Amino acid sequence: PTAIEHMEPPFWWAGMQHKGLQLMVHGRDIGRMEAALDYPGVRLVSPTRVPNANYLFVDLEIGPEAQPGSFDIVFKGDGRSERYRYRLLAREQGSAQRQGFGPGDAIYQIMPDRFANGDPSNDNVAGMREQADRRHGGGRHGGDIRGTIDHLDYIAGLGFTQLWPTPLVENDAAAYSYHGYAATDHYRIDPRYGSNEDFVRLSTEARKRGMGLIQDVVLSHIGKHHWWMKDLPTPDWINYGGKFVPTQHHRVAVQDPYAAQADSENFTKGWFVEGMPDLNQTNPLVANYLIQNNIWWIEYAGLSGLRIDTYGYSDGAFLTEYTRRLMAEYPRLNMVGQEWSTRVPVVARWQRGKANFDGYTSHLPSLMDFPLVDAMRNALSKTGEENGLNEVYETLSLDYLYPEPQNLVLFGGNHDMARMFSAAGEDFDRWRMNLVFLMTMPRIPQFYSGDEILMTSTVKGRDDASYRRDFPGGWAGDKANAFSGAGLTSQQRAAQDLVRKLANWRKNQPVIHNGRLMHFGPEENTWVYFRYNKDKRIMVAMNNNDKPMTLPTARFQEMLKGAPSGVDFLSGKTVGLGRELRLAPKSVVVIELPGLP
Amino acid sequence: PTAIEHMEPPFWWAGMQHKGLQLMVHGRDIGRMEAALDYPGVRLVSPTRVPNANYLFVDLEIGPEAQPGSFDIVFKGDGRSERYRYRLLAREQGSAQRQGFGPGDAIYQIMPDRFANGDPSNDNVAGMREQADRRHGGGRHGGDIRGTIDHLDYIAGLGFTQLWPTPLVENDAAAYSYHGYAATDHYRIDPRYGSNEDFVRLSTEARKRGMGLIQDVVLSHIGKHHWWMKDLPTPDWINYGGKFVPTQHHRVAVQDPYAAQADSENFTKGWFVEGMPDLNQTNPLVANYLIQNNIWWIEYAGLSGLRIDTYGYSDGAFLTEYTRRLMAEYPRLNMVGQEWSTRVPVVARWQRGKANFDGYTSHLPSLMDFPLVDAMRNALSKTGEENGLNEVYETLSLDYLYPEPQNLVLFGGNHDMARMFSAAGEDFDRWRMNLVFLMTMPRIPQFYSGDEILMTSTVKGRDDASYRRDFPGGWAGDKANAFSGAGLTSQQRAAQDLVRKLANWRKNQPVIHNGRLMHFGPEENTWVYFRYNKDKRIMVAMNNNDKPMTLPTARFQEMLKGAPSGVDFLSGKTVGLGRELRLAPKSVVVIELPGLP
Ligand SMILES: OC[C@H]1O[C@H](O[C@H]2[C@H](O)[C@@H](O)[C@@H](O[C@H]3[C@H](O)[C@@H](O)[C@@H](O[C@H]4[C@H](O)[C@@H](O)[C@@H](O[C@H]5[C@H](O)[C@@H](O)[C@@H](O[C@H]6[C@H](O)[C@@H](O)[C@@H](O)O[C@@H]6CO)O[C@@H]5CO)O[C@@H]4CO)O[C@@H]3CO)O[C@@H]2CO)[C@H](O)[C@@H](O)[C@@H]1O
Ligand SMILES: OC[C@H]1O[C@@H]2O[C@H]3[C@H](O)[C@@H](O)[C@@H](O[C@H]4[C@H](O)[C@@H](O)[C@@H](O[C@H]5[C@H](O)[C@@H](O)[C@@H](O[C@H]6[C@H](O)[C@@H](O)[C@@H](O[C@H]7[C@H](O)[C@@H](O)[C@@H](O[C@H]1[C@H](O)[C@H]2O)O[C@@H]7CO)O[C@@H]6CO)O[C@@H]5CO)O[C@@H]4CO)O[C@@H]3CO
Ligand SMILES: [Ca+2]
Ligand SMILES: [Ca+2]
Ligand SMILES: [Ca+2]
Numbered sequence A, B: 001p002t003a004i005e006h007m008e009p010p011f012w013w014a015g016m017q018h019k020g021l022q023l024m025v026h027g028r029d030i031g032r033m034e035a036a037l038d039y040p041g042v043r044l045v046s047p048t049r050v051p052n053a054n055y056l057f058v059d060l061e062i063g064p065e066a067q068p069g070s071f072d073i074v075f076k077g078d079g080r081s082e083r084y085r086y087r088l089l090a091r092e093q094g095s096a097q098r099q100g101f102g103p104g105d106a107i108y109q110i111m112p113d114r115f116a117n118g119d120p121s122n123d124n125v126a127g128m129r130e131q132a133d134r135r136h137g138g139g140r141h142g143g144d145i146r147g148t149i150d151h152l153d154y155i156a157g158l159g160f161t162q163l164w165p166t167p168l169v170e171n172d173a174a175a176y177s178y179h180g181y182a183a184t185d186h187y188r189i190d191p192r193y194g195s196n197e198d199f200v201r202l203s204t205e206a207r208k209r210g211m212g213l214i215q216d217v218v219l220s221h222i223g224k225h226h227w228w229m230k231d232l233p234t235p236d237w238i239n240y241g242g243k244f245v246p247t248q249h250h251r252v253a254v255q256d257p258y259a260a261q262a263d264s265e266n267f268t269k270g271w272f273v274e275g276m277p278d279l280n281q282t283n284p285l286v287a288n289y290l291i292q293n294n295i296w297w298i299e300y301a302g303l304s305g306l307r308i309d310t311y312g313y314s315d316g317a318f319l320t321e322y323t324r325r326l327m328a329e330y331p332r333l334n335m336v337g338q339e340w341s342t343r344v345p346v347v348a349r350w351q352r353g354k355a356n357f358d359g360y361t362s363h364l365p366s367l368m369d370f371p372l373v374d375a376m377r378n379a380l381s382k383t384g385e386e387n388g389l390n391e392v393y394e395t396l397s398l399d400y401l402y403p404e405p406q407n408l409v410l411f412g413g414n415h416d417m418a419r420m421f422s423a424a425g426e427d428f429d430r431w432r433m434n435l436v437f438l439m440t441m442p443r444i445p446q447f448y449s450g451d452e453i454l455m456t457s458t459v460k461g462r463d464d465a466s467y468r469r470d471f472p473g474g475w476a477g478d479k480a481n482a483f484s485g486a487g488l489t490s491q492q493r494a495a496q497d498l499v500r501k502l503a504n505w506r507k508n509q510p511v512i513h514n515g516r517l518m519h520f521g522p523e524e525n526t527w528v529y530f531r532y533n534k535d536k537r538i539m540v541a542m543n544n545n546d547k548p549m550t551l552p553t554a555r556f557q558e559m560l561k562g563a564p565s566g567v568d569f570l571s572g573k574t575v576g577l578g579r580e581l582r583l584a585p586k587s588v589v590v591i592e593l594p595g596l597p
């Protein structure tokens, strides 16, 4: 290396909650040196040396009296000296109290490579290991930050208030770089997306449009081409001594009274795939690194929260400390973990407030509601079943297992699953039911880019390329363009208009954000539920059958209290409620009524 | 009619835990009368009248100073007087402390009409509404108490230590009387089975052979031919005023934060079927009636516990009081509730010691483990799945939801589901895996009569008659006799030999009764688990594939601790364990090893 090759974090802030700052310094023979500084309020601790000559860890304590400014950190040894001018930034007013995404928000999810190519010139970047190929399902297609910024008006116009892009951090792999989940530099935006500065600008431009930005963070693993892999900072930085030992994905092993240590270790230490070296988070240097890096991104880019990948694949004790550190800095933040299980108890284990049988404590505010998404996809697909909606009702009834079920993220789909429209059997009427459900449940709704124009995919197993097709209109020359409307079918445009109608309506319905829910047991694949408070009732009724259904309204009188009729927000039709509710085949209605006494 | 037509309970005991005793007296204008008695230690409370002149409720407080003996209760009014000689029996020594069935037991379930016809002369009883018809799948076939007693040596010899017959109380219906679930007289054995005394004899004879007797009690409903229905004791005795209003079976409605009262009431008050009037257990007279009746059967017939039908279909507050009362009398008893859900949270809600979100409390010791049975049947039948056993492992990992998972009843099958052998696809090798699992899990195993000779049924849908075919050998003239072994095929006899082998072995295995369990996540439909303590290890390994599989034993070292080999109890063969476990296609081994320090 040349003097100091990497300084991480590269700068920090005065006035953080945790006073300690640990710098990870990288350069040839830097480990052979001693650090010194002189700045009021900043104390240099006592060297803890690592055996690798090319790394030095420097512990600072930044007292509350430290002012924003800069100071040289000088590194002396072997008759030489090296300098780094370290900067402490002033924090933005209100930084610590930043409001995280919550029940009043709706999240729009993109994959940056697959959304919009605003700058074809950065599709390839000289020096990088992969060449772009738009026709390869696993290739880089060239979407970037410029393209995303170009279309913030569209996203906000649809009624979304938060943007979640899959990771933009450097993934300099020879193949499958596009997906972002195998970081090769945690402190750098992949140059094919743009610069670190462009990412900050994406945040500021989103904010001007009333949208927060949620970063997708991977804690458990990196990519095999990470610069660490050439010269391991410590022998135990990577689990299994830096050699590939696969995980077998026994997720319940971390939360099972009958667990073998072999299985729990294999889950948190095993490598996801050979191309994804697993971080040893039981090493305090690794824990500190990840915690500081994510805090750095939040403070630097003005994030509204995080989506945390591969949640339970990280060490359990590390996760307690990581979530504690993050929530201590930003007490109103939201962070949504991805615990990919359709079992309510497995997901609920991780949410802040949960009383666990083993005393495990977490500070994680939110999780992805895979169980409920799975239940609704089953109801919509199992067309041969008399009462598939029962799975949704019974899954919802388990919400008492979560300390804060209204903070969970419910989603129409994402980059890992069959397209929402395909999961509905390409049945527009069933799709409407799914969309109404998403927009009215006591959850934080998240929507996957492309679903608003009924993009389709394969349905069975895992077929990732199928779920990540280029957004129509994201590339110059596209003959179907969802941004302008050009080339959409009437049905695709109707879907898009309905997404806009419901998402913007939801923004202004406090009863959906924090109201009570009363649902009724589904009967013959009809289902009725209500969101309600002193101000408003919203009645949802769906008929998941190809025949009409007539439901006596006596059953629902604890919610209806004699209401003779109402207007369906969707179709705008009046709907009788006096004695019977007549539902057309495959109908869903959404009826606003005044609040109960 | 007859002066006093019913007196219930007909006698009681000195020295019960609960001092109060409420007599329900029935006869023409008995309600017009005034009761009187004189017996030291017994206090007559003073009448609380009901509008029906044909019923009188007499409230007694039997003090701890009351001695065994008998006394007249005299009823006076309208210039007339009636009397009943009331007996307080002395309790058998050790009655209150009786040990309920538990983890060391194995339960053999029969339907008394379908097991053994020891006396063809009671197949029909003069005056009753249904005639026997052995060729009707829903008819009475003639099984009785005599036949069951005749074959107690068989049941004990198979290794079972408890007998659970489906209900024997009078079911005097014109159709479908055989199954027992629609009582027409809670204080009388159906005369087609025998007398009350014969049932007591069944208990005493079973006890001689080391077996307890578990009674199957229905609390929620009765049959429409119950004598009550002719002259309702009170207008609210039966839910919905004695008129048929069906339940829609929304079982989660009683334990759901979002529940409608309509749905909860429909679950606990709705009639199961038109032929099964639903008891209003919110009426304290009905609550007292059922609590006393079940105590009466336990005390009178020397039962080891109860199996409680249609568990959540009874009023929740009633269940709290009923379980408290029963367990206050018999603190060591076991009672297994039938909460038919494959959702672990739904089942776990009811077990004693559970901290429920709504504060619901219960003294119920046990429930039927439908979730784990369903998981194993899926694993063994869906043989095209790569790792179907993963469902069993994950389900078992949720055991922390239950306060006492070791006290749950796990079963091979029962009278309401597809025959065990048929559910395993008539695959004897996979059926062996089910049987080994049943006999080695940290549960109380229950086995269904006929499964030991691989009786078959339909598998699709619900076909009750198909699950309940007569036991071969239970009727004079049967061509095959499973009791003697005559006329069994080699595969039938092999099944029966394996049941006898494993159940008798299990009686002698404290490590299965109360040892720890450590299981490993299944991989490619192979699964390894251990029962262990300082005295013994039992390693179960199953290969749920039609191909050989080899498992490196390094994975299991926390349990194996370098064991080079062990003897498989099934085959008697020594199995190598030093470096790998080599499993043949579709095999299961039960390797016995020394203790784990
Ligand atoms: O040996 C198992 C399996 O391997 C083969 O699949 C290969 C696959 O074809 C290939 O594309 C690659 O997948 C990549 C993927 O494209 C990337 O996106 C990245 O995946 C990350 C993902 O985007 C994240 O959102 C996140 O999702 C994870 C979850 O965290 C996990 O829990 C797990 O979810 C499973 C869930 O737990 C189960 O309940 C069940 O529903 O199945 C889910 C999987 O569908 O995985 C998801 C999705 O990956 O985290 C991911 C990792 O950061 O990285 C992936 C790995 O490179 O991986 C495979 C090998 O190269 C083969 O086709 C299968 O037949 C075989 O069974
Ligand atoms: O004492 C009554 C009954 O109770 C116990 O089992 C109950 C259980 O407690 C209930 O929660 C409920 O569970 C499920 C079923 O498992 C599920 O299959 C479904 O049930 C429907 C059936 O699918 C459908 O065929 C029909 O069932 C009919 C049945 O075909 C008839 O044979 C007849 O069943 C009688 C049984 O033969 C008799 O043993 C007794 O059942 C007991 C059961 O043994 C006991 O362990 O009485 C019944 C009723 O006469 O009639 C029924 C009803 O017409 O309809 C049902 C209901 O839709 O849904 C329920 C609820 O989720 O049922 C089980 C099993 O009966
Ligand atoms: Ca580009
Ligand atoms: Ca890991
Ligand atoms: Ca008989």
Ligand SMILES: [Ca+2]
Pocket: B220, B221, B267, B268, B269, B270, B278, B279, B313, B314, B315
């Ligand atoms: Ca009932």
